[PDB]
Write a protein that binds this ligand. Structure first.
Ligand SMILES: Nc1ncnc2c1ncn2[C@@H]1O[C@H](COP(=O)(O)OP(=O)(O)NP(=O)(O)O)[C@@H](O)[C@H]1O
Ligand SMILES: [Mg+2]
Ligand SMILES: [Mg+2]
Lengths: 317, 621, 325, 116
């Protein structure tokens, strides 16, 4: 599956993980993920290994071989694991769980247990890391975004809205803007600080974006730091412009008939390096690839028997 | 400073006691509030002399029967360290027994079997004082209490429970000493020997195996080798399998097999449990039925029956594994709330009284529950409705399983996906249509639905203050005549279910969509919300009486099932104070009743809170 | 058992012969004959055995009217059922008698409970028809039930009007408040009319709204009636009597009949008994209100005999309403 | 005597009997006298009427010591209690209910022939 420079992976409740190519439109292979569902997917930066985070275990999947089983099934976390994240070299993999623990484990070794642990009062929603790989934004269920220092373990915590569940967070590669998204349908964007190791890493909030009137789930910056995509529970994803946070782009799957409502949420998004094609997952069994400029159905990845949740996307020249 | 404080307290307390006693004498029936206030003043300042003489004079002057309202609280402080307070408590209890032994024997019987030394010997002393003039009634109550405790849990029952617990301990906790501690009472009752036909049959069937296991245990702690332990486990497993296969066959117990003494006694002078009332003739235990129906639930209660001296059957549900003292005190608090709602004319007109039953604990593990007639559990009601309509009982649950067969294994928002899919694709109007169908006429339907909504609001707010959890549909019941809601199990009061590790409850009360649809079609913004506001105002204004009733939990080990115990109890009461005053949600802020009720309705209706509920709670319902 | 019996269809729809039934005696006789013929043509032998006793004892026929209709109805085919529905609709629509309407609404709710299902009385199972019939029949719990069925089928501001009205005429100001909150949440765009406050028992606000709407439209009937109702409820007898004197000279006689009740009440409150004599003339003599107010006038003039038979007539007229309610 | 309102409380069935007269009898004079008695006794508060007949009881509801209950029809009520079983068994049930309603009543002895 690692032959093509362009690769994406998909997973959900069907106890399987599927892989797709940009211009194929047909699943390459389906690999079983029995015994549990799946919450997150991520392809390592080196494009040699995929982490699938589900319930009480994180599974590792090869990218160059031909239809193997899971190769390393890490276990130990007593409850649901919610997020994944890798270093640029891929040795250290970050993660957050529903058991009030945000952890960092090893990948290039045979260690069978965690390497670093961090406590937080509430379960950890999706976690993300600063591009320089020296700071962690951890999103808890209590709404308190945690700034965690990798070189001093300093745990700053900012709650921009009391008693709400922040659902996801993402920081652009340029380390200029960072976005967080919660169940209130709001996108909170803060300016970064141009620090390296000065321990400052100050975050300066900006104007609030009423992204949705419904539970907003996944917010992600583009690799070019030009556009942001926020997909929510109202079957709507909005692609805001980083320049002014305006919007002329709607991503909806509403049938339009009141008798066909509750079709399914959009559960995630993934930009491309060029950032003109965006792939998102939709709990109506299906993943959709659109183009931001026109917002039309470029491809639909049929094959999932049950609903889809999480996606990963890696591309190369 | 301290001396002036004491002087001010005494000069503002002694007039308080005098006035309260005068008001109680002038009330004659509507005096639960005043009696509780007197008890609070007596407990907090009775040891002070002048307060002591004032209380003595008031007690001597005041009618005795009034104190029947507050028998538990008195016994909850029977072991007060202060000399004068304890002396007056004992004298008052002795008087209450002298004139009204029927009301006070059962709580005293419960207190006698207390592990605490002070409570134990005080209860023994008061029972001796009772005996001094009513030896017959005292021993009769003791005998019937012991026999009903015996019938509550058969030797089968406690042996099965102990074997189950040992299996968890040895394999789960690897606690062999814990196993020995758990088993020691079982060996103790073996040494006690059989005393009924069922006990003798169980002896002849399994006692030899049990003694052989005891012998390998003797070998174990005489040598210290797990080989003897495993030899014991062999017969433990065999007897456990035998008893487990036998248990479902005990669908109905005949008394002569399990308790011939109940059959021997007839035309008793003891009052039927939970029916004594000094203003009416005493209904007495004429006989006991020759067969007890048994429910197939996990705890296995017994549908016991009495034939009263008035010829009317009195049905009870006899529990053996639950602490019924909590249920009794919750019934007392419900009685206080009923008094409060009747006192206010606005709430009095609306019939906001909480339906309640009689709870008679017999020990720290067993008791009797009044079997309320013409009532159906919400689970049973919905089951009957869906069987009748050919709708499938678990339709929402299997819709969730179809969307996610591992529904329990998802993250929060994925669980919200599944839960909202199940809710939005199912009508959820079972209770509305069922209230309509179970009503003779639209007049009766409207009356029943008004009562249902108002009682649901009353119990929602009271349970929230009470922290009453585990409100699953089987724990709610509906009247076939009045329509009021009845809450029957109170084993998870004070947010106990909201802190347990496994499937913690994230809602204050049950307000699922099925209930809200049975309300006015316009929703819960009307009758329900307004009744909640009314009840919260009534409770917040009279929070002193609620705290007075709840002090019984402060000075008892009831919530344990020891300064840690006191710390936990005061923490729970602080939480209840926060709920009543309004500082529950944010300690730094106080909320008016509309705001608090809106927040609580949002919490009880939120899908994030509802989806996390354990599946058998039927949050989708 | 004895099996079923053939429901003679001809005589069955013949028993529903409301074509030439006009007077109250006619309609009571129609109800009696229908309740007897249902038993006579009942399919179940158990009911038909009671027909002979019902004939000589009508209350038996009244007791089994619902069951007798169920037995007769379950045998008819689609076309015969449709004819029966048409005749039932005609019976409900024809004349508003408390006894006959009460019996028919009781039958409707009985069929609603029965496994046969609600009577397909119209496209809406007679929900609208039965609701309005219950409303004007003084039986407001049935009216509430059918109005809530209307609401479930779809909420409209008119359904909210009627639902507030019914709930407050059931003495449920809290339910009416709930309906108001539903309106404000889901219909905040529309401007809440004066009739809402009138039915919410918000008499002061209702009067304010009626005044604010009347200044733009002089001499409007419905506005006048609502303003008078608000004034009577508020106890403003002086203003009510001033309004009555001002507008009595131009009101239509049909609407003057509606004027008369509140006019007489206000005049009594003040004490212009000649004005009461003038107003009570318009109140019909066949209504309890008319007889009672005529008795009041007679007593003020000290015609004790006249007031006595007026009170007797008032009781006789109130007998039907009291029996129905 | 002015013994008003109290008769409802001391005779809870009085109001029910007076109202039931309006349903049963047809003579206009008797009905007018029934209405006269109803008015003379007073228009009882519906809540007070419920209290008199016991549908609402604050003596037991507000009592601190709860008390156990002392036990373990119209055509519509008959259907409600009979809706579980078919109509074929409902017809004889309601027929017998009405027949017994007449038959226990001795004042209708002249119908007891046909009833049997
Ligand atoms: N007070 C009561 N009045 C009438 N029926 C009752 C009463 N208490 C219990 N029941 C009925 O008996 C059933 C079993 O009793 P219950 O109290 O549910 O025992 P359990 O299931 O062992 N308790 P828990 O595990 O705490 O839910 C109930 O579901 C009701 O049907
Ligand atoms: Mg149970
Ligand atoms: Mg229970």
């Amino acid at each position: 599956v690692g032959s093509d420079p362009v690769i994406l992976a998909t997973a959900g409740y069907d106890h399987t993980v599927r892989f797709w190519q940009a211009h194929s439109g047909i699943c390459t292979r389906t690999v079983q993920h029995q015994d549990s569902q799946v919450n997150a997917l991520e392809v390592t930066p080196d494009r040699s290994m995929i982490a699938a985070a589900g319930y009480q275990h994180i599974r590792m999947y090869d990218l160059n071989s031909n239809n193997p089983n899971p190769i390393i099934s890490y276990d130990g976390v007593n409850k649901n694991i919610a997020s994944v994240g890798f270093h640029e070299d891929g040795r250290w993999m970050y993660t957050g769980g529903e058991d009030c623990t945000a952890r960092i484990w090893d990948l290039r070794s045979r260690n069978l247990q965690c390497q670093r642990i961090f406590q937080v009062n509430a379960p950890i929603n999706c976690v993300c890391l600063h591009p320089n790989q020296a700071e962690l934004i951890v999103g808890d269920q209590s709404g308190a975004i945690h700034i965690w220092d990798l070189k001093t373990d300093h745990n700053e915590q900012l709650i921009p809205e009391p008693e709400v569940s922040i659902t996801s967070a993402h920081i652009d590669p340029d380390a200029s803007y960072m976005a967080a998204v919660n169940s209130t349908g709001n996108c909170y964007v803060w300016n970064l600080t141009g620090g390296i190791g000065d321990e400052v890493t100050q975050l300066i909030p900006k104007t609030k974006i009423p992204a949705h009137t419904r539970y907003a789930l996944q917010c992600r910056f583009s690799p070019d730091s030009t556009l942001l995509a926020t997909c929510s529970a109202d079957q709507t994803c909005k692609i805001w412009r980083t320049s002014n946070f305006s919007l002329m782009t709607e991503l909806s799957i509403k049938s339009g008939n009141p008798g066909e409502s509750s079709r399914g949420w959009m559960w995630g998004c993934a930009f491309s390096g060029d950032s003109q094609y965006i792939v998102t997952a939709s709990s109506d069994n299906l993943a959709r690839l659109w183009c931001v400029e026109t917002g039309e159905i470029k491809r639909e990845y049929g094959g999932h028997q049950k609903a889809v949740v999480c996606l990963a996307f890696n591309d190369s020249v | 400073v301290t001396e002036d404080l004491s002087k001010t307290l005494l000069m503002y307390t002694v007039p308080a006691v005098q006035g309260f006693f005068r008001s109680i004498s002038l009330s004659r029936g509507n005096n639960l509030q005043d009696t509780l206030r007197v008890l609070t003043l007596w407990f907090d300042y009775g040891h002070w002399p002048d307060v002591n003489e004032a209380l003595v004079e008031g007690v001597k002057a005041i009618q005795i029967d009034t104190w029947l309202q507050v028998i538990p609280q008195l016994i909850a402080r029977i072991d007060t360290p202060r000399p004068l307070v304890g002396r007056l408590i004992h004298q008052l209890l002795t008087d209450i027994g002298r004139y009204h032994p029927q009301a006070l024997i059962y709580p005293l019987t419960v207190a006698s079997k207390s592990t605490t030394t002070a409570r134990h010997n005080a209860a023994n002393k008061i029972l001796k004082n009772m005996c001094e003039h009513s030896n017959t009634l005292v021993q009769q109550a003791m005998m019937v209490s012991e026999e009903l405790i015996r019938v509550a849990i058969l030797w089968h029952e406690m042996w099965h429970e102990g074997l189950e617990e040992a299996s968890r301990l040895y394999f789960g906790e690897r606690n062999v000493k814990g196993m020995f501690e758990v088993l020691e009472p079982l060996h103790a009752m073996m040494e006690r020997g059989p005393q009924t036909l069922k006990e003798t049959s169980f002896n002849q069937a399994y006692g030899r195996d049990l003694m052989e296991a005891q012998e390998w245990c003797r070998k174990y702690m005489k040598s210290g080798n797990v080989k003897d332990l495993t030899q014991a486990w062999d017969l433990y497993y065999h007897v456990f399998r035998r008893i487990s296969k036998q248990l479902p066959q005990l669908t109905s117990l005949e008394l002569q097999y399990v308790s011939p003494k109940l059959l021997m006694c007839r035309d008793l002078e003891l009052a039927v449990p939970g029916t004594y009332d000094p203003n009416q003739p005493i209904i007495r235990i004429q006989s006991i039925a020759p067969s007890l129906q048994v429910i197939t639930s996990k705890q296995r209660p017994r549908k016991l029956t009495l034939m009263g001296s008035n010829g009317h059957e009195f049905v009870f549900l006899l529990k053996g594994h639950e602490d019924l003292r909590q249920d009794e005190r919750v019934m007392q608090l419900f009685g206080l709330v009923n008094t409060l709602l009747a006192n206010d004319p606005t709430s009095l007109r609306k019939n906001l009284s909480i339906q309640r039953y009689a709870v008679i604990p017999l020990s720290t593990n067993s008791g009797l529950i009044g079997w309320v007639p013409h009532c159906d559990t919400l689970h049973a009601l919905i089951r009957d409705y869906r069987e009748k309509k050919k709708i499938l009982l678990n339709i929402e649950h299997r819709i969730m399983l179809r969307m996610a067969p591992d529904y329990d294994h998802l993250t929060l928002m994925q669980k919200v996906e599944v839960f909202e899919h199940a809710v939005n694709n199912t009508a959820g109007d079972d209770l509305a249509k069922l209230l309509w169908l179970k009503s003779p006429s639209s007049e009766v339907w409207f009356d029943r639905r008004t009562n249902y909504t108002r009682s649901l609001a009353v119990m929602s707010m009271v349970g929230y203050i009470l922290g009453l959890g585990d409100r699953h549909p089987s724990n709610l019941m509906l009247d076939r005549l009045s329509g009021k809601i009845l809450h029957i199990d109170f084993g998870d009061c004070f947010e106990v279910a909201m802190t347990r590790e496994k499937f913690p409850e994230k809602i204050p009360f049950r307000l699922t969509r099925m209930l809200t649809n049975a309300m006015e079609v316009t929703g819960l913004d009307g009758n329900y919300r307004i009744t909640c506001h009314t009840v919260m105002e009534v409770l917040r204004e009279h929070k002193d009486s609620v705290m007075a009733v709840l002090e019984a939990f402060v000075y008892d080990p009831l919530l344990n099932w020891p300064e840690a115990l006191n710390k936990k109890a005061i923490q729970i009461i602080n939480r209840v104070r926060d709920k009543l005053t309004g500082r529950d949600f944010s300690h730094d802020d106080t909320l008016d009743v509309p705001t608090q009720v809106e927040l609580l309705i949002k919490q009880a209706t939120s899908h994030e809170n509802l989806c996390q509920c354990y599946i058998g709670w039927c949050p989708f319902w | 058992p004895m099996k079923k019996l053939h429901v003679s269809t001809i005589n069955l729809q013949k028993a529903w012969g409301a074509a030439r039934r006009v007077s109250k005696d006619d309609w009571l006789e129609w109800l009696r004959r229908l309740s007897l013929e249902l038993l006579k043509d009942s399919s179940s032998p158990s009911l038909r055995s009671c027909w002979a006793l019902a004939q000589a004892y009508n209350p038996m026929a009244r007791d089994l009217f619902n069951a007798a209709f169920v037995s007769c109805w379950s045998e008819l085919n689609e076309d015969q059922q449709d004819e029966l529905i048409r005749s039932i609709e005609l019976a409900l629509t024809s004349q508003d008698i408390a006894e006959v309407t009460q019996t028919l609404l009781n039958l409707a709710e009985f069929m609603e409970h029965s496994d046969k299902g609600p009577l397909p009385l119209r496209d809406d199972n007679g929900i609208v028809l039965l609701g309005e019939r219950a409303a004007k029949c003084r039986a407001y719990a049935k009216a509430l039930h059918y109005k809530e069925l209307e609401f479930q089928k779809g909420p409209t501001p008119a359904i909210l009007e009627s639902l507030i009205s019914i709930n407050n005429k059931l003495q449920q100001p809290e339910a009416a408040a709930g309906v108001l909150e539903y309106a404000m949440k889901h219909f905040g765009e529309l401007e809440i009319q004066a009739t809402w406050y009138e039915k919410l028992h918000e008499w002061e606000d209702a009067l304010v709204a009626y005044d604010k709407k009347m200044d733009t439209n002089k001499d409007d009937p419905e506005l006048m009636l609502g303003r008078m109702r608000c004034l009577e409820a508020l106890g403003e007898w002086g203003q009510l009597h001033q309004q009555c004197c001002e507008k009595w000279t131009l009101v239509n006689d049909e609407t003057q009949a509606k004027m008369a009740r509140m006019a007489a009440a206000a005049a009594w409150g003040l004490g212009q008994w000649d004005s009461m004599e003038e107003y009570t003339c318009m109140i019909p003599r066949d209504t309890h209100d008319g007889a009672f107010y005529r008795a009041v006038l007679a007593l003020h003039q000290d015609l004790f005999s006249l007031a006595q038979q007026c009170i007797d007539k008032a009781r006789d007229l109130l007998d039907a309403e009291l029996t129905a309610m | 005597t002015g013994y008003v309102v109290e008769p409802y409380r001391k005779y809870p069935t009085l109001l029910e009997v007076l109202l039931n007269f309006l349903k049963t009898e047809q003579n206009q004079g008797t009905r007018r006298e029934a209405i006269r008695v109803l008015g003379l006794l007073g228009a009882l508060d519906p809540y007070k009427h419920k209290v008199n007949i016991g549908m609402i009881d604050q003596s037991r509801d507000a009592s601190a010591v709860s008390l156990s209950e002392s036990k373990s029809y119209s055509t519509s009520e008959m259907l409600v209690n009979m809706g579980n079983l078919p109509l074929d068994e409902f017809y004889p049930a309601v027929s017998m209910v009405a027949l017994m309603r007449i038959f226990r009543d001795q004042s209708l002895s002249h119908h007891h022939t046909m009833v049997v």
